[PDB]
Design a protein around this motif. Structure first.
Motif, mmCIF file in Angstrom:
data_model
loop_
_atom_site.group_PDB
_atom_site.id
_atom_site.type_symbol
_atom_site.label_atom_id
_atom_site.label_comp_id
_atom_site.label_asym_id
_atom_site.label_seq_id
_atom_site.Cartn_x
_atom_site.Cartn_y
_atom_site.Cartn_z
ATOM 1 N N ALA A 51 52.061 32.625 51.701
ATOM 2 C CA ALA A 51 50.821 33.401 51.695
ATOM 3 C C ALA A 51 50.918 34.677 50.905
ATOM 4 O O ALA A 51 50.184 35.661 51.197
ATOM 5 C CB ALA A 51 50.378 33.632 53.158
ATOM 6 N N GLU A 52 51.755 34.695 49.847
ATOM 7 C CA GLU A 52 51.724 35.884 48.999
ATOM 8 C C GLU A 52 50.352 36.064 48.366
ATOM 9 O O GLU A 52 49.901 37.208 48.168
ATOM 10 C CB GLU A 52 52.818 35.752 47.914
ATOM 11 C CG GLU A 52 53.016 37.014 47.087
ATOM 12 C CD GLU A 52 52.140 37.171 45.870
ATOM 13 O OE1 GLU A 52 51.412 36.202 45.560
ATOM 14 O OE2 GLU A 52 52.187 38.279 45.312
ATOM 15 N N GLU A 53 49.722 34.943 48.000
ATOM 16 C CA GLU A 53 48.430 35.047 47.293
ATOM 17 C C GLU A 53 47.329 35.542 48.185
ATOM 18 O O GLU A 53 46.264 35.871 47.639
ATOM 19 C CB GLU A 53 48.109 33.691 46.653
ATOM 20 C CG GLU A 53 49.097 33.246 45.583
ATOM 21 C CD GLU A 53 49.094 34.045 44.310
ATOM 22 O OE1 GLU A 53 48.321 35.022 44.219
ATOM 23 O OE2 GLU A 53 49.875 33.709 43.350
ATOM 24 N N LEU A 54 47.550 35.626 49.495
ATOM 25 C CA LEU A 54 46.552 36.190 50.413
ATOM 26 C C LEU A 54 46.733 37.686 50.574
ATOM 27 O O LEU A 54 45.932 38.268 51.314
ATOM 28 C CB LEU A 54 46.662 35.548 51.815
ATOM 29 C CG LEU A 54 45.874 34.239 51.994
ATOM 30 C CD1 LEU A 54 46.438 33.145 51.111
ATOM 31 C CD2 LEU A 54 45.900 33.804 53.458
ATOM 32 N N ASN B 150 54.393 28.324 37.030
ATOM 33 C CA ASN B 150 54.977 29.636 36.709
ATOM 34 C C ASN B 150 54.789 30.596 37.847
ATOM 35 O O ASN B 150 55.711 31.374 38.183
ATOM 36 C CB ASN B 150 54.381 30.172 35.394
ATOM 37 C CG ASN B 150 55.162 31.397 34.956
ATOM 38 O OD1 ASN B 150 56.393 31.471 35.053
ATOM 39 N ND2 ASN B 150 54.426 32.366 34.417
ATOM 40 N N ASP B 151 53.596 30.616 38.467
ATOM 41 C CA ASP B 151 53.324 31.549 39.567
ATOM 42 C C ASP B 151 53.221 30.755 40.869
ATOM 43 O O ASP B 151 52.084 30.299 41.201
ATOM 44 C CB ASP B 151 52.013 32.308 39.350
ATOM 45 C CG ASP B 151 51.823 33.387 40.381
ATOM 46 O OD1 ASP B 151 52.816 33.805 41.023
ATOM 47 O OD2 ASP B 151 50.638 33.828 40.507
ATOM 48 N N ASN B 152 54.272 30.561 41.649
ATOM 49 C CA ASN B 152 55.627 31.081 41.424
ATOM 50 C C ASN B 152 56.653 30.022 41.716
ATOM 51 O O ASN B 152 57.710 30.272 42.327
ATOM 52 C CB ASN B 152 55.859 32.334 42.276
ATOM 53 C CG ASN B 152 57.205 32.964 41.993
ATOM 54 O OD1 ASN B 152 57.649 32.969 40.825
ATOM 55 N ND2 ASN B 152 57.837 33.480 43.027
ATOM 56 N N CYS C 18 47.663 30.801 31.572
ATOM 57 C CA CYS C 18 47.243 29.917 32.652
ATOM 58 C C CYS C 18 47.464 30.562 34.004
ATOM 59 O O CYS C 18 47.516 29.899 35.037
ATOM 60 C CB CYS C 18 48.002 28.590 32.549
ATOM 61 S SG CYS C 18 47.436 27.606 31.152
ATOM 62 N N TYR C 19 47.505 31.891 34.004
ATOM 63 C CA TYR C 19 47.677 32.664 35.239
ATOM 64 C C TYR C 19 46.589 32.265 36.229
ATOM 65 O O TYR C 19 45.382 32.345 35.977
ATOM 66 C CB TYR C 19 47.606 34.146 34.870
ATOM 67 C CG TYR C 19 47.743 35.072 36.044
ATOM 68 C CD1 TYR C 19 48.767 34.980 36.980
ATOM 69 C CD2 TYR C 19 46.795 36.075 36.214
ATOM 70 C CE1 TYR C 19 48.837 35.865 38.029
ATOM 71 C CE2 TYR C 19 46.861 36.955 37.288
ATOM 72 C CZ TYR C 19 47.890 36.831 38.203
ATOM 73 O OH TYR C 19 47.980 37.718 39.272
ATOM 74 N N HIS C 20 47.005 31.843 37.423
ATOM 75 C CA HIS C 20 46.134 31.497 38.552
ATOM 76 C C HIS C 20 45.185 30.370 38.193
ATOM 77 O O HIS C 20 44.116 30.257 38.805
ATOM 78 C CB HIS C 20 45.362 32.726 39.029
ATOM 79 C CG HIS C 20 46.271 33.592 39.866
ATOM 80 N ND1 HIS C 20 45.825 34.750 40.412
ATOM 81 C CD2 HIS C 20 47.560 33.498 40.247
ATOM 82 C CE1 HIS C 20 46.787 35.331 41.108
ATOM 83 N NE2 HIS C 20 47.885 34.591 41.043
ATOM 84 N N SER C 21 45.555 29.550 37.190
ATOM 85 C CA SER C 21 44.659 28.502 36.680
ATOM 86 C C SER C 21 45.133 27.124 37.007
ATOM 87 O O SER C 21 46.294 26.910 37.347
ATOM 88 C CB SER C 21 44.668 28.667 35.156
ATOM 89 O OG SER C 21 44.128 29.951 34.800
HETATM 90 ZN ZN LIG Z 1 49.723 34.935 41.832
#
Ligand SMILES: [Zn+2]
Ligand SMILES: N[C@H](Cc1ccc(I)cc1)C(=O)O
Ligand SMILES: [Ca+2]
Ligand SMILES: [Zn+2]
Length: 275
Positions: free
Chosen positions: A130-133, A96-98, A243-246
């Motif tokens: 690298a959006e998560e950074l 889902n993300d992303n 389950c966000y970021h899981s």
């Molecule tokens: Zn995220």
């Protein structure tokens, strides 16, 4: 605009899931699952006729990539962009993300080719690294886009988390024309929308330099309220995405209806805003 086939969007998610499984369980910046995700998306676009560019950057001592795909033709002075980050956190596959937004943007780009569409505005699609950074790839893109090209951007449409299993239907309240276009699609479905408030995604570097932006979101770690469950169904008191970021942000962490609706809305907006 065409109706984006949900099964095709789901098939891209299956490919991203397998890529994560083959690469240590994730698609994160600096890890092989990310570049393998880029290679998959790029091959589909190249075969469809896009001119693709791999834009390399270094963050955290590791090479990152944005994938840029220009549809040949259209007015060079009026460019409509749409994008989605393609990296995940390292705890899981980031379906889902992303994967959700990445797959909807990819299938919309493939749909332009399948339809033989010649938009009046030049179309450019992006998959950010690298959006998560900290939005590193989209910041890199905007920071390295000359001002003369920035002024040619008619809009940037962002899709980050659009298949949440307990979804809401949030539309960014940014540029008025882009927001109206998305809300009109949902009105035609008789599905209510709310303003996004749950922001920090890859439209921010564009918004901050005056490019009109908008986008779609189905909710993350915040809990769905009783009123939101009454309008959209699902489960009040549970996160939009449990389950966000899981590690459980897997193929099972998708609501097919939300994925379908938001993919179709993405195509509607890209068609409407590029004439
Ligand atoms: Zn995220
Ligand atoms: N971790 C953020 C969650 C997030 C997505 C979209 C918006 I707008 C705001 C927040 C992400 O990468 O999707
Ligand atoms: Ca559809
Ligand atoms: Zn995200």
């Amino acid at each position: 605009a065409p109706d984006i086939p949900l099964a095709n969007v789901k098939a891209h998610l299956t490919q991203l899931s397998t890529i994560a499984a083959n690469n240590g369980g994730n698609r994160a910046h600096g890890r092989p699952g990310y570049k393998a995700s880029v290679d998959y998306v790029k091959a589909k676009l190249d075969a469809a006729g896009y001119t693709t560019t791999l834009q390399q950057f270094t963050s955290g001592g590791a090479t990152g990539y944005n994938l840029i795909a220009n549809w040949p033709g259209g007015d060079p002075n009026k460019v409509l962009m749409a994008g989605a980050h393609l990296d995940s956190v390292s705890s899981g596959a980031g379906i889902n993300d992303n994967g959700s937004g990445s797959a909807a943007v990819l299938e919309t780009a493939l749909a332009v080719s399948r339809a033989g569409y010649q938009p009046d505005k030049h179309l450019r699609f992006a998959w950010w690294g690298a959006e998560e950074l900290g939005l590193i790839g989209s910041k890199f893109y905007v920071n390295n886009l000359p001002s003369a090209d920035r002024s040619k951007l008619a809009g940037y449409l962002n899709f980050d988390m659009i298949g949440s299993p307990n979804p809401g239907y949030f539309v960014y309240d940014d540029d008025p024309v882009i927001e109206k276009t998305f809300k009109n699609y949902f009105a035609g479905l008789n599905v209510p929308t709310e303003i996004e408030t749950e922001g920090r995604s890859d439209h921010a570097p564009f918004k901050n330099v005056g490019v009109p932006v908008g986008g779609l979101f189905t909710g993350a770690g915040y809990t769905k309220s009783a009123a939101q469950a009454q309008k959209w169904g699902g489960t009040a008191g549970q996160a939009f995405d449990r389950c966000y970021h899981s590690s459980c942000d897997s193929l099972s962490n998708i609501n097919d209806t939300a994925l379908d609706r938001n993919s179709d809305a993405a195509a509607h907006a890209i068609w409407t805003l590029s004439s």
